Design a protein around this nucleic acid. Structure first.
Ligand SMILES: [Mg+2]
Ligand SMILES: [Mg+2]
Ligand SMILES: [Mg+2]
Ligand SMILES: [Mg+2]
Ligand SMILES: [Mg+2]
Ligand SMILES: [Mg+2]
Ligand SMILES: [Mg+2]
Ligand SMILES: [Mg+2]
Ligand SMILES: [Mg+2]
Ligand SMILES: [Mg+2]
Ligand SMILES: [Mg+2]
Ligand SMILES: [Mg+2]
Ligand SMILES: [Mg+2]
Ligand SMILES: [Mg+2]
Ligand SMILES: [Mg+2]
Ligand SMILES: [Mg+2]
Ligand SMILES: [Mg+2]
Ligand SMILES: [Mg+2]
Ligand SMILES: [Mg+2]
Ligand SMILES: [Mg+2]
Ligand SMILES: [Mg+2]
Ligand SMILES: [Mg+2]
Ligand SMILES: [Mg+2]
Ligand SMILES: [Mg+2]
Ligand SMILES: [Mg+2]
Ligand SMILES: [Mg+2]
Ligand SMILES: [Mg+2]
Ligand SMILES: [Mg+2]
Ligand SMILES: [Mg+2]
Ligand SMILES: [Mg+2]
Ligand SMILES: [Mg+2]
Ligand SMILES: [Mg+2]
Ligand SMILES: [Mg+2]
Ligand SMILES: [Mg+2]
Ligand SMILES: [Mg+2]
Ligand SMILES: [Mg+2]
Ligand SMILES: [Mg+2]
Ligand SMILES: [Mg+2]
Ligand SMILES: [Mg+2]
Ligand SMILES: [Mg+2]
Ligand SMILES: [Mg+2]
Ligand SMILES: [Mg+2]
Ligand SMILES: [Mg+2]
Ligand SMILES: [Mg+2]
Ligand SMILES: [Mg+2]
Ligand SMILES: [Mg+2]
Ligand SMILES: [Mg+2]
Ligand SMILES: [Mg+2]
Ligand SMILES: [Mg+2]
Ligand SMILES: [Mg+2]
Ligand SMILES: [Mg+2]
Ligand SMILES: [Mg+2]
Ligand SMILES: [Mg+2]
Ligand SMILES: [Mg+2]
Ligand SMILES: [Mg+2]
Ligand SMILES: [Mg+2]
Ligand SMILES: [Mg+2]
Ligand SMILES: [Mg+2]
Ligand SMILES: [Mg+2]
Ligand SMILES: [Mg+2]
Ligand SMILES: [Mg+2]
Ligand SMILES: [Mg+2]
Ligand SMILES: [Mg+2]
Ligand SMILES: [Mg+2]
Ligand SMILES: [Mg+2]
Ligand SMILES: [Mg+2]
Ligand SMILES: [Mg+2]
Ligand SMILES: [Mg+2]
Ligand SMILES: [Mg+2]
Ligand SMILES: [Mg+2]
Ligand SMILES: [Mg+2]
Ligand SMILES: [Mg+2]
Ligand SMILES: [Mg+2]
Ligand SMILES: [Mg+2]
Ligand SMILES: [Mg+2]
Ligand SMILES: [Mg+2]
Ligand SMILES: [Mg+2]
Ligand SMILES: [Mg+2]
Lengths: 121, 118, 116, 48, 221
RNA sequence: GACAACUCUCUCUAAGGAACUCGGCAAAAUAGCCCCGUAACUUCGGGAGAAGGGGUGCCCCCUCGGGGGUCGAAGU
RNA sequence: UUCACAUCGACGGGAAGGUUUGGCACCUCGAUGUCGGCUCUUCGCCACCUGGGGCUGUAGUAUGUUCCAAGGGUUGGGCUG
RNA sequence: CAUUGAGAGGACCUUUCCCUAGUACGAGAGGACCGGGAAGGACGCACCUCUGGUGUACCAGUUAUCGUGCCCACGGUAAACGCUGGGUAGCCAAGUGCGGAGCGGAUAACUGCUGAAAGCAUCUAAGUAGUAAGCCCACCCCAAGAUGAGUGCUCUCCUA
RNA sequence: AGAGAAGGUCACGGCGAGACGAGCCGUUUAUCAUUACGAUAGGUGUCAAGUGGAAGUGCAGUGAUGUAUGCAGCUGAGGCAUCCUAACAGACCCACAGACUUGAAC
């Protein structure tokens, strides 16, 4: 349930420490980013001397919410923080290595991302 | 011959005996460290293994629910399993923790140490 | 709204309504019959029966639970004496409510609640 | 908000008659109640 | 509003969860039945002006029914019933007064139904709750909050419009929920499980018809 | 008595956290005590309770603060 | 590129509307009062999108212009009285 | 009791993506019309199985203090919960379902077929054919105070 | 004029109905013996559910406290049973075979 002005942690190498979400995309006029949605964020805090400068406008996909994802098993999933992964407009992650768990719900639109994951839920 | 309120309760008891027949379900309470094995609709090869502590158990009928908390790669994950689900294969109690509540929701605000397993 | 909210409010806040009911039941057990407003009566049923059903068992536990409801000890002990005698066979339903002429001052509907 | 005009005699008589009709239903309850206490058979009712 | 096929009536018993082999949980309303669903009367185009069949539902003690009604069910040769309803068909040849309907013969599995019932009464409700009015500002200076807003334009037109949305009574009405699905029929308990919600709390009275699809089940116009 | 809308005095609210608005207006937050630590700047008095951090209940034991135990999700 | 009329259209002319800046002083002066937001509508069409078309300097994709069409839609912020 | 429906309203909205097919089209680069399929958005109608919010019905911890003779244990107060941690029913959404169907009717623009007035031509004068998120029926609620007060089934009209 | 038609209102017990009116359900609570229809509310008994391990008495400990008795104790706005209380007593309205004409039938 990411929405504009929400702050996020980044899940990969890409050298952004923190993102502020400004827009949800592809959802038409929706206000809610949930897992698997592309958001336009900006960089707030960066990891120094990295290809990414703060105050950059970038795309990222939301891989973790504190809201709850519902599969068809009746299974539910809730993380402790919000996080996204910074991508290209191709679906390829800019940074090459991902932290944290992800879901099998991303397997359709993003292959790379499920691949680089340390754990899958 | 069955009166109606009876019908509503009865259908749950039928469902649960029907499900406990195929797959007997363990005595499972709050504060129980637990290992679960899911049959995922994708990957026939390996049935997913979720470890973790039980923070809550909501009893209702066929849909009785268990909430497993675990720290994974530094990110706290809680998962909610319907207990009688066909997609669960094996479930067992690894260990038992001594707890004074019915729901440990306070495990979010505590340190990661307490959610760390395996 | 209220659907399925079953409680009697008696137009008092929670604290006062509790204390009211404690009071009214110590009165009922002390005098055996009393005159009140139909609302207060209908509300008071439940707690009367709670005390009676309580004293049917008699354990130090139960007795402590009654002492912490009723105001006057003496009445409680009297209960735990009398009740096994007087109510032993009656399975529930220990109160009669016999309604009367309304009050002159406000036209509040009255009633007579009896310990049966 | 105020009354731009003064209410005409007849309309006022109709509204007050409406308020007087409640007396009619009260008189019916009262009558029925009297005929109930006038047999001395009611165990739900009490008078002193 | 000519209705496709005969429907039956039933009682809403409340909802539970229902698994499928692959572990898909569908929430289902459980619709029970009672002694009834008996054709009461049949109305011919000639006699009544149109074609319809009146089914009775709930049984009842005899006393509770009124003399006119009891006479109405004595003409049929049927047991006393609480609720009567009418279904409106295009062809009534299959039905005779006193005939009985079985919901097991009119409804298979994977079939589409339509559930009519009465809604939960929420009483007298404000503008917010009844029409989804946005509430005004809670804090900086503002005295409005849950209030209705302005109700019209200025000197012209100089009166409020008809149908202008306002607080009044909400709920408690005949509602129809289109295109539902029947998950499982239980013969033992004579119950039907339907995927999703139907109006009203348990102990309601429902009407189930086979779904009206505006192209293919109904007269074109 | 009843427990509608709505107004007012109040308590709480999932995810987010000023996106509200003329304006963080109003609310929420902080808070005692002991201990460590404390900047630019200066009329050398200040700034300063700067900031920021730790400790805190109840039992025994020792010295006249320290150690050991023990409950609770939480100890001014 | 040829070609006034795909698209522009100078010099001039003929209109409609009553939303701009105005003229008038018929209007109310006692307490018939201007611009923005909130809430809440509603209507017009000179059509921004969505439905159907004609012409193109329309290969295709995308346009351009115009015809019918007002059923629905018309975001969230930084900035300003 | 059950209904017909004059009239009145609500709703008939929209975006990507995938087959068609990398097919027509073009030297290439680019890349379709038409018709099928899914997922979304907004909006509407419900609903409480799940996830929750509240829940001054309840349950537990716990501070100060006054009661119950004192320990124990409970009760009061700390406005309209002392402060916290949970919560069933209700109500509710962020949760769950469902909806937007029509080889129906008549048209606007336009495209047409037969075809005269003007032995040629012309979509028009006769007569007709396609066709729009528009118009009207169908969908959903209301509805005979529709004083034009409808139709249907049954019931009741005692005693002197 | 007596009486009280069918039905209605009131009364009385209620509600998932309700600002009030209105709506809906009840009003001796069956019999059964093979279905179902005769439990409205409260109480009582049991069940789901919540909370999370009662008091008392034992043991361990210098003590705060832990542990056994015990899925305990409290609660149970939800179900299902059972007439134990209250649905007692009753009251009011209400009964010109449906004015008049014209055809048709007999
Ligand atoms: Mg739950
Ligand atoms: Mg008052
Ligand atoms: Mg208090
Ligand atoms: Mg009770
Ligand atoms: Mg009826
Ligand atoms: Mg209601
Ligand atoms: Mg708003
Ligand atoms: Mg205010
Ligand atoms: Mg006027
Ligand atoms: Mg009040
Ligand atoms: Mg307070
Ligand atoms: Mg919040
Ligand atoms: Mg929070
Ligand atoms: Mg938060
Ligand atoms: Mg923050
Ligand atoms: Mg701002
Ligand atoms: Mg700012
Ligand atoms: Mg703004
Ligand atoms: Mg302030
Ligand atoms: Mg404050
Ligand atoms: Mg504080
Ligand atoms: Mg300090
Ligand atoms: Mg300073
Ligand atoms: Mg501190
Ligand atoms: Mg400590
Ligand atoms: Mg020209
Ligand atoms: Mg003048
Ligand atoms: Mg004035
Ligand atoms: Mg136009
Ligand atoms: Mg267009
Ligand atoms: Mg065009
Ligand atoms: Mg081109
Ligand atoms: Mg339009
Ligand atoms: Mg319009
Ligand atoms: Mg518009
Ligand atoms: Mg109808
Ligand atoms: Mg019509
Ligand atoms: Mg009219
Ligand atoms: Mg219409
Ligand atoms: Mg349509
Ligand atoms: Mg090709
Ligand atoms: Mg298409
Ligand atoms: Mg859709
Ligand atoms: Mg729920
Ligand atoms: Mg529930
Ligand atoms: Mg809570
Ligand atoms: Mg709840
Ligand atoms: Mg004392
Ligand atoms: Mg206390
Ligand atoms: Mg005091
Ligand atoms: Mg005070
Ligand atoms: Mg007070
Ligand atoms: Mg609380
Ligand atoms: Mg939905
Ligand atoms: Mg035509
Ligand atoms: Mg042409
Ligand atoms: Mg010719
Ligand atoms: Mg021709
Ligand atoms: Mg013609
Ligand atoms: Mg057509
Ligand atoms: Mg159309
Ligand atoms: Mg369409
Ligand atoms: Mg009529
Ligand atoms: Mg007439
Ligand atoms: Mg009668
Ligand atoms: Mg009435
Ligand atoms: Mg009543
Ligand atoms: Mg009676
Ligand atoms: Mg009962
Ligand atoms: Mg009941
Ligand atoms: Mg004990
Ligand atoms: Mg206690
Ligand atoms: Mg000892
Ligand atoms: Mg339990
Ligand atoms: Mg019985
Ligand atoms: Mg009795
Ligand atoms: Mg006659
Ligand atoms: Mg005559």
């Amino acid at each position: 349930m990411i929405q504009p002005q929400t702050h996020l942690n980044v899940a990969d190498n890409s050298g952004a420490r923190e993102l502020m979400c400004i827009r949800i995309i592809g959802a038409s006029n929706r206000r809610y980013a949930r897992i698997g949605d592309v958001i336009v964020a900006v960089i707030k805090e960066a990891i120094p001397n990295t290809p990414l400068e703060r105050s950059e406008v970038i795309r990222a996909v939301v891989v973790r919410t504190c809201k709850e994802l519902k599969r068809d098993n009746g299974m539910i999933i809730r993380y402790d923080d919000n996080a996204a992964v910074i991508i290209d407009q191709e679906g390829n992650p800019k940074g090459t290595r991902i932290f944290g768990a992800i879901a099998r719900e991303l397997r359709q639109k993003f292959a790379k991302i499920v691949s680089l994951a340390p754990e899958v839920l | 011959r069955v009166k109606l309120g009876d019908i509503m309760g009865i259908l749950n008891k039928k469902a649960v005996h029907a499900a406990e027949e195929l797959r007997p379900v363990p005595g499972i309470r709050t504060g129980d460290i637990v290992q679960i094995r899911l049959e995922v609709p994708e990957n026939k090869r390996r049935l997913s293994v979720y470890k973790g502590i039980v923070i809550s158990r909501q009893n209702a009928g066929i849909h009785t629910t268990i909430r497993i908390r675990r720290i994974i790669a530094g990110v706290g994950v809680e998962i909610v399993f319907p207990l009688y689900s066909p997609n669960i294969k094996e479930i067992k109690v690894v260990s038992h923790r001594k707890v004074r509540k019915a729901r440990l929701y306070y495990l979010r605000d505590k340190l990661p140490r307490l959610s760390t397993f395996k | 709204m209220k659907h399925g909210r079953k409680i009697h409010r008696l137009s008092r806040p929670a604290d006062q309504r509790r204390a009211l009911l404690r009071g009214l039941t110590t009165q009922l057990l002390k005098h055996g019959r009393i005159k009140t407003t139909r609302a207060k009566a209908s509300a008071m049923r439940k707690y009367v029966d709670k005390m009676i059903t309580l004293a049917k068992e008699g354990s130090l536990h139960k007795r402590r639970q009654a002492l912490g409801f009723i105001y006057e000890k003496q009445i409680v002990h009297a209960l735990f004496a009398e009740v096994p005698e007087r109510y032993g066979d009656r399975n529930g339903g220990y109160t009669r409510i016999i309604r009367t002429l309304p009050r002159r001052g406000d036209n509040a509907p009255m009633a007579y609640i009896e310990l049966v | 908000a105020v009354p731009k005009k003064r209410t005409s005699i007849y309309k006022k008589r109709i509204r007050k008659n409406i308020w007087k009709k409640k007396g009619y239903w009260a008189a019916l309850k009262a009558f029925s109640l009297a005929k109930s206490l006038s047999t001395g058979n009611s165990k739900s009712f009490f008078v002193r | 509003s000519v209705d496709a096929g005969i429907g039956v009536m039933g009682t809403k018993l409340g909802m539970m969860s229902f698994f499928e082999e692959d572990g898909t949980v569908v929430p289902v309303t459980v619709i029970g039945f009672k002694e009834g669903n008996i054709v009461t009367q049949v109305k011919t185009e000639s006699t009544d002006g149109y074609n319809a069949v009146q089914v009775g539902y709930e049984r009842l003690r005899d006393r509770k029914l009124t003399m006119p009604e009891r006479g109405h069910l004595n003409k049929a040769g049927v047991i006393p019933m609480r609720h009567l309803q009418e279904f409106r068909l295009v062809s009534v040849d299959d039905f005779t007064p006193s005939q009985k309907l079985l919901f097991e013969e009119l409804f298979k599995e994977g079939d589409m139904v339509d559930i009519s019932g009465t809604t939960i009464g929420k009483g007298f409700q404000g503008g917010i709750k009844r029409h989804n009015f946005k509430r005004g500002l809670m804090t900086h200076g503002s005295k409005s909050h849950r209030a209705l807003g302005s109700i019209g334009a200025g000197t012209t037109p100089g009166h409020v419009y008809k149908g202008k949305k306002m607080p009044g009574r909400m709920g408690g009405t005949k509602t129809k929920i289109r295109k539902l699905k029947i998950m499982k029929i239980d013969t033992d308990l004579r119950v039907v499980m339907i995927k999703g919600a139907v109006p009203g709390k348990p102990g309601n009275l429902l009407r189930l018809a086979p779904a009206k699809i505006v192209g293919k089940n109904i007269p074109k116009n």
